[PDB]
Design a binder for these strands. Structure first.
Ligand SMILES: Nc1ncnc2c1ncn2[C@@H]1O[C@@H]2COP(=O)(O)O[C@H]2[C@H]1O
Ligand SMILES: Nc1ncnc2c1ncn2[C@@H]1O[C@@H]2COP(=O)(O)O[C@H]2[C@H]1O
Lengths: 200, 200
DNA sequence: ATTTCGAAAAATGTGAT
DNA sequence: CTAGATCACATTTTTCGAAAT
DNA sequence: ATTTCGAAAAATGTGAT
DNA sequence: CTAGATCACATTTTTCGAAAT
């Protein structure tokens, strides 16, 4: 569309290879990102290094907006590329110039925040009310909805490690493993290595 | 300030008593609120009633905005009022227009969304990385930031039932007290009935 | 591109406490 | 009372860098 | 109307499980 | 294991509406 086009025009495009880091938690925030292609992972670490995945973002999604609204803000999390990415970049200052000449570009970003908030609040509840099995069940169902999910004859097929699932639901990798085995005993999913098919 | 004044102008200001709910999770959202005076608690419930305080929102905060950007959306959580509230209302439709002739108001809202994202995100970290003690600890510091909080000569002072805290960190009324005492013991806080002083 | 190949790096199951 | 977290490695699985089609 | 007062509800302190 | 949730009570704080002011 005419807007998310005149926008990329004022953006410096960059390419990150898979697994590379795009945003270091704690660093000064002054740049704003928009994913033209590929997908990233937004995660936070603890003093020990343990990682918790807050979300996956993809083509169309903005990154690093949380710093644009006030001076003195440091990145709130790490953002590591899930796949090779093509990322549009622009400075906050160079961006507020744009809001003042078509705030629609702002509504689009804002909508995306509104969503992230809802979604992240959702996770808070999951963590607070559901046991691990529920959270894992829930995550598999979500993961199956992500765009990087392939379609399988018996449902939707996905690739993820127990380690990673454990970093989404916040439980150990061992536990994920046992739970995965029980969901299969109940013919809910067929687990084979990193390939997990979620039955329709 | 100037703008926020202009905004209120088009808002059908109202009055809400304490314990009264402003938003019902699940209903169609078509209204945007603004707390002129008072304070509210945004909260969510489990399948059987349990509550989780996502956040306290005071004066100057907007309410029911996640419904503003997309269509056919439902309120994402319950919003009850702590003290008595003076809440400015306004329809999304009329609001959207207000933005048209001055995107600065939309900026303000978005700024508030951004901080709510960070905070909710940091809440996820806490729930996944910390044990109750750490959670209760962390909440205490935070509660000692809300406007309804007085200033003590040692740190700060607030009023909150052990029940509430149990609902903000996500643990039982018991655990909250047990760990609370341990806190007094290890001389780090000052408690008594429903009053607390955090040492800084 | 993606297919194949042989390391080399990562992810796993274990199961009593 | 009780969901899960732990712990160290031998054993799997997957990823990786180069040669091929 | 505002305040004062003594049941109820709400909130706790516990130790065991 | 081992933080925490539960359970079943006795014992305080607060909450509130009626009654005094
Ligand atoms: N809860 C979340 N959901 C989605 N994206 C997030 C979340 N928390 C942080 N991020 C993204 O990660 C970025 C980290 O740096 P910023 O704070 O600049 O901006 C943040 C967002 O782009
Ligand atoms: N995690 C949160 N942090 C802060 N405010 C929130 C959060 N979740 C919901 N809200 C507010 O609660 C409102 C509930 O209804 P809406 O979804 O219309 O808009 C929501 C926000 O204004």
């Amino acid at each position: 569309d005419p807007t998310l086009e005149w926008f990329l025009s004022h953006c410096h495009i960059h390419k990150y290879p898979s697994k590379s880091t795009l945003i270091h938690q704690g660093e000064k925030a002054e740049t704003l990102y928009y994913i033209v292609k590929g997908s990233v992972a937004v995660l936070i670490k603890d003093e020990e290094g343990k990682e918790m995945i807050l979300s996956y973002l993809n083509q169309g999604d903005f990154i690093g907006e949380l710093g644009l609204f006030e001076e003195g803000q440091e990145r709130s999390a790490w953002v590591r590329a899930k796949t090779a990415c093509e990322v549009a970049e622009i400075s906050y200052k160079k961006f507020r110039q744009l809001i003042q000449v078509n705030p629609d570009i702002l509504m689009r970003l804002s909508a995306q925040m509104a969503r992230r908030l809802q979604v992240t609040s959702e996770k808070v509840g999951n963590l607070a009310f559901l046991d691990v099995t529920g959270r894992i069940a829930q995550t598999l169902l979500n993961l199956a909805k992500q765009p990087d999910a392939m379609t399988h004859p018996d449902g939707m097929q996905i690739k993820i490690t127990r380690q990673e699932i454990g970093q989404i639901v916040g439980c150990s990798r061992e536990t994920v493993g046992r739970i995965l085995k029980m969901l299969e005993d109940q013919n809910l999913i067929s687990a084979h290595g990193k390939t997990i098919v979620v039955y329709g």
